[PDB]
Amino acid sequence: GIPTELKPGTNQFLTTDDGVSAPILPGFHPTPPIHIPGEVRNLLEICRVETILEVNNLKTNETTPMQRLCFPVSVQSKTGELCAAFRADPGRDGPWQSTILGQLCRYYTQWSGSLEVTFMFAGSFMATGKMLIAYTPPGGSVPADRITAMLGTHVIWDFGLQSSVTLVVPWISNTYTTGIITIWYQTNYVVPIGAPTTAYIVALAAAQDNFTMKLCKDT
Amino acid sequence: GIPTELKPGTNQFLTTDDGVSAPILPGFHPTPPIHIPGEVRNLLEICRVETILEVNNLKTNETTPMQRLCFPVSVQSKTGELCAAFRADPGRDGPWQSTILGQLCRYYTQWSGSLEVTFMFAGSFMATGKMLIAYTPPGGSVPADRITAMLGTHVIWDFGLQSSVTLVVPWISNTYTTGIITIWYQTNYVVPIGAPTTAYIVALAAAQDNFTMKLCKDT
Amino acid sequence: GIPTELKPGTNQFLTTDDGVSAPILPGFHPTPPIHIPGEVRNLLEICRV
Amino acid sequence: NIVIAYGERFFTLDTKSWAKDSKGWYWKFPDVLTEVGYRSGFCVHVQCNASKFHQGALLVAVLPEYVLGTIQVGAVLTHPYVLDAGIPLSQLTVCPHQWINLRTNNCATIIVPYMNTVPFDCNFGLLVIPVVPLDFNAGATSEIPITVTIAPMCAE
Amino acid sequence: NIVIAYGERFFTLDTKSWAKDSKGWYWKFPDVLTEVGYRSGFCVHVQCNASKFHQGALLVAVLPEYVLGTIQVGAVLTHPYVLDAGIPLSQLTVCPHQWINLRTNNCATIIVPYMNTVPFDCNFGLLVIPVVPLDFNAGATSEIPITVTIAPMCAE
Amino acid sequence: HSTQETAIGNFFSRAGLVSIITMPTDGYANWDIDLMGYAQLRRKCELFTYMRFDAEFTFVVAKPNGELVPQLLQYMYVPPGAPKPTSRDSFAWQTATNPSVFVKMTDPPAQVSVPFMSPASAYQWFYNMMGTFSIRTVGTKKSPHSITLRVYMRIKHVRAWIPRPLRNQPYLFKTNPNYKGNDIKCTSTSRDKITTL
Amino acid sequence: HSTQETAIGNFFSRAGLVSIITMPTDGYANWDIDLMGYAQLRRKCELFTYMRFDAEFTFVVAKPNGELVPQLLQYMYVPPGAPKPTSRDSFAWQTATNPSVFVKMTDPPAQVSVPFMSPASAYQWFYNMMGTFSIRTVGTKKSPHSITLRVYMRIKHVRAWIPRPLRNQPYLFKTNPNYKGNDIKCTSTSRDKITTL
C-alpha cells in the first residue's frame, strides 16, 4: 500500500463542513425539475421591494392594529409644526420591525448600504397643501423648528400635483448611527366644502442596490 | 507519508454501496460466456407481453380455478345491459393480480404510463353480434346504461368480422385514479341451429412503451 | 490534510492478496541471475512428456 | 400600468360595496368561475367607480397557495391585520400587487401565469384590503362599488 | 404467421382426442423422437381439424427446463391452473406461444433454436392447454384430433 | 464586499439539531423525518412556497452521561410507502429494500444523504412524506446500556420559489398555520407619542 | 424520467441478510452458500432460468447483546470440491488452498468477493455448488464468549436469460418446486359479482 499519515483533526464532526457523503439510494432517479416562475437566487431580491412600515405605533393602537399603517393629517394643525419622527435603523425595535428589510436583517449582524422611503397620500382630490420631509445626518441633533430643518437635507412635497415622494438615505452602518426623518408642516391643510377634513399617509420602505450584509446569526 | 484526515462517516457498513472488494481467488479464471438467446436487459421487456387476466373472479370459482380466465356471453341476455366491469389498476387487488404487469409493479411504489387491453372471442364461426367496450375517465362515475357510455371513450366491436379488439388506456398514475372498463351488450347474441348458445371471451393486458416505474420496495 | 474515508474491509488479513510490503533490507543488492538451462514457465511443460 | 407576475371572453363577477367599516374580501381561483357560463392563465381586472370627493386606498394582491386558519361572492375577512393566516398585511407587497388610490387612478389589473409543481392539475387567491378607510361627508354616496373582471388566457 | 423464439424429414406423432373435459397434454423434448425412425434445432407444427360448428381455444407454448412437482404419447395434466409446477397458466405468454382459436385458424408452428448453458450436451417442453373448453350440440363429432408434427433442423 | 453571504445556499447551511431520541432500558424507536420540529427552520422555510433540495443526516450517539460503550447499532431508513417496524424482532428489519447502516458507538458518526423523494417537482408546505427512520440495537438479548442520540440535518442544493410574508405569530399546531383569536400581538414595538424620537 | 431503475443490475442490488449463525459456549460452524434461504431472493431469482453473476459477502459479528470483545476470528472459504472441516482442530484449517481471512470483533467487517464458480456458462435453478464457509475462533483453548454473526450478500454484474412465470404458491421443500394438492389458492382476489365495480 501507499504510505499515509493521520494529521490532527480526524474523527471529529464539524457542523459547517462541505463533505460529500454516500447516498442512501444509488439507483434512484429523482423527478426532473420544470420551469417554475419566480425563482429567488439571493435574499436581496426580497429586500428590494417597498413594504409598509408602522410609524403610528402608539399605545392606544394595540387593540385595533389596522390603524398602525397610516398617520393622519388634519386642518386644525398649525403651520411650522411637527407631524411625525422616526429612526432609520432596520435592526433595532421601532417602526422598522414591520418591514421585510428589518426582518431579514435580524438573521445577520452587520449591514451597510443605502435605503429609500416612499410616502403615499390617500386624501381627497380637491385638497392641496405642502409637507416638508427633512433628514438629519447621523451624529447630529433633532431640529426644533422648520427653519433649521430646511438647512439640511430635505425635499418639499406638495400633494396637489404629485402623490408620492421618495427620500433616499445616503448611508447607514452598524458595527450612535441614527437617521431621524422628520415630517414638518410647511403649509396648512386646505379643503373645500364637501371634502373630508382628515387624510392619511402610508409610508413605504425599501433598500437600494448597494445594501449588503454578512455575519449570519440565528435569532 | 502524505497528510490525511478521517472525515465523519468511516468504519460504517451501508448496504447499498458500490464498493470494490478484494477477490477471494485472484488466480482464478472464470468460464467465458457464450451466446444464450433471450437476454433480458430490462424489466420492461417482461411487462410488454399480453398475459391473461382474471376478470371472472367470483366466489363460486374458487374450487374450479380454470373458469376464472373467461367470462361468458349468452343468448338469453337482453340488449343494452351490462356484462362485466373491472378496475384498471395493476397495484391493488382484483383482476390485475393474475398478470405479469401487476406482479412486477408490486416490487415498486410509483408507476405511470399507458396500458392496453386486448380481448379475444372463442365462439362459433356461424355466430355474430356486437359488443360495446366503454372506458370512463378517472374521476368520473360508472355509466348506468348504454346511452351515456357511448358519449365517452368507446369502441364498437363486432365479432362477425374481427376476432380481437384492442382498447388503449390513455394514462394511469399512482402517487382515486380508477379506469373502469365496462362491457355492454350492443346487439343480442344470435346463432343458427347447431351452433352453441354460449361463448367465452378471454381478456389480455399489456403495457405500452411509455410505462415507467421507480421507488423499489420489497414485499 | 486531504479528506479520506474508511470503507468496510480494513484491518483484515486475506491470505491471497497482492500486497506490496516494506522490505526488511532496503540497501541489500541480491545476486544477479545467470542463464540456467531448463526453465519451467508453466506446469503444462511437465504434463506433456 | 400593466404589471406581470414575476416577469413572465370577459367574465364579470358581482360588485362589492365598500362601506365605512369594511375589512376586506378574498376570492379563490379558479373556483370563482366553476358555475357561470387543467392548465390556464389569468388576466384579472379590478376597478371601482368613485367621485372626486371620496378618499381611500385599496391593496389588490394575488397570493399563491393562500391557506386559512381557525380562530362567486367571496368571503369577508375577519382579522385583516394578520389576513386570517398569520402573515402580516404590511409585508404583502412581496407578492405581485397594485395600489388602488382614489386620488389618482381607478383601475388595477394583474397578469398571472400558471404556477404549480405539476404542469397538469385552488392555485392562488386575490385579496382586496382597504388599508386606508373610506371617508366622506354627509349627503354623499355611502357605498362605492368594486367590480372584478376576470379573463382567462391560453387554457389547456 | 411464423413465430421465432426470442428473435433468433417430418416426424408425425399420434393424434390426441380433444374431449369435453380435457385438461391438457405435454411432451418432453427431445425424448419424443428417441424410439421412432447432441445439438440441434426444432420446428414443431401443431394443427387440428374441426368444423365450423365447434368452438374453443388452445394455448400452445414451449417451456424451457419445465420441471414437475409431486401432489411419445405424452402425459395428461392433472391441475392445469398451476401446470403441476406452481407457475400460473395466465402468465404463460411470456414464453414463445401461439393461440389456436377454432373460429379463425387451425394451425400453429413455433421455431425453437438451441438453448443451453453448454453448447454440446431434456431441454424444453411443449404444453397444449384447452383454456376455453370445447362446446358443441348433440349429433356432432364428440372428439377433435390434434396432430403434432416435429421437424428437426441443423443437427450436430 | 460581494453578495455571497446572502445566497440561498448559504442561508440553509450550518446543520443544527432536528431531533433527540432517548432509548432507556422497548428497544426500538420510530422517528418521522420532519423539518418543522422546532421553532427554528420553520419560520425560515415558510419564507418561500416551493423548495427543492436533498438531505444529509448525522447520528451522534452516546450514553446519557458522556461515555461510550462497545455496542453495535443499526439505523434503518424506511422508504415512503413501506411498512414501519412494529416490534423489535419484526420482519421489517430484514427487508432488503430498506437500506440500513451498521456502526458502533466507538465509531465516528454515520453520514447518510437522502435525495429528493417527492413525486412532484418541489416540496409544498401550504396546500411530501420524505421518510421515516428506525433505530434499534442488534442481537436477540436486551442490551444493559441506556442509549441516547441526536440527529443533525443539513440542506444542500437549495432552490426556492414564490416568496411569502414571514410569520410573526406563535404557532399552535404543526399541520396548519393557526393563531389565537383572543389577542393579536403587534409586530412592532410601541411608544408613547409619534413625535418622541 | 429514464428507465434506469428497472434495469437488471439495480433489481438485484441492496444486499440483505442471507444467513444467521449462533455459536454459543462445539466452536465451529459450517454454512453452505445458498441463495434460496429465505422467502425473499427466491421468488425474485425464479423469474428467469439462467443467471450469471458474482458474489459479495460481509460478516457483521457481535455478541448476543450489542457489545464487542477483543476476540480474533477466522472465516475460511472452502472451494467446491474440497473436504469440509469436521472438527475444531482438523487438518482442513491449515490447508493453503482454502483462502481465509483474519479479522477481530473491534474491526469493521470483512468484504469478500466470490467469483463465478460454475463449470457451465450460467447458473441453473431448474434441472452449481458455489461453495461453503467455515467460521471458528483461533487458539487451542475455549473462548469464554458467546459469538453470533449475520452474513449479508450482494449480487453484482447480473445477466439473466429465459424469463419464467412467477411463483404464486407457497414453497414446501427447497430442492423441487412442489405445492400442496389438497387446495389450490387463487392468485387474484374474488368479489361477489362480475358487475360490481
Residue numbers in the entry:
A (entry chain C), B (entry chain C): 1 to 175, 189 to 232
C (entry chain C): 1 to 49
D (entry chain B), E (entry chain B): 30 to 37, 62 to 90, 102 to 135, 155 to 204, 210 to 244
F (entry chain A), G (entry chain A): 73 to 97, 104 to 205, 228 to 297
The authors write:
Like other enteroviruses (EVs), CVA16 is a nonenveloped virus of ~30 nm in diameter with a single-stranded, positive-sense RNA genome of ~7.4 kb in length packaged in a protein shell termed capsid.
From the same CVA16–8C4 dataset, we deduced three conformational states, namely C1, C2, and C3, at the resolution of 3.05, 2.91, and 3.36 Å and population distribution 15.5%, 27.0%, and 57.5%, respectively. Moreover, the VP1 hydrophobic pocket is empty and collapsed in C3 capsid, but filled with the pocket factor in C1 and C2 capsids. Collectively, these data suggested that the viral particles in C1, C2, and C3 adopt the native/compact mature CVA16 virion, the compact empty particle, and the expanded empty particle configuration, respectively. Moreover, structural comparison revealed that the protomers of the CVA16–8C4 C1/C2/C3 showed the most similar architecture to that of mature virion, compact empty particle, and expanded empty particle with the overall Cα RMSD values of 1.098, 1.178, and 0.937 Å, respectively, confirming the identity of these viral particles. It appears that 8C4 Fab binds only to the native mature virion (C1) and compact empty particle (C2), rather than the expanded empty particle (C3). In contrast, compared with CVA16-8C4 C1, CVA16-8C4 C3 displays a quite large upward movement for the expanded capsid and in particular an obvious outward tilting movement of up to 5.2 and 4.7 Å toward the Fab for the protomer 1 and protomer 2, respectively. Such a large movement toward the 8C4 Fab may create clashes between the CVA16 capsid and the 8C4 heavy chain, thus prevent 8C4 binding.
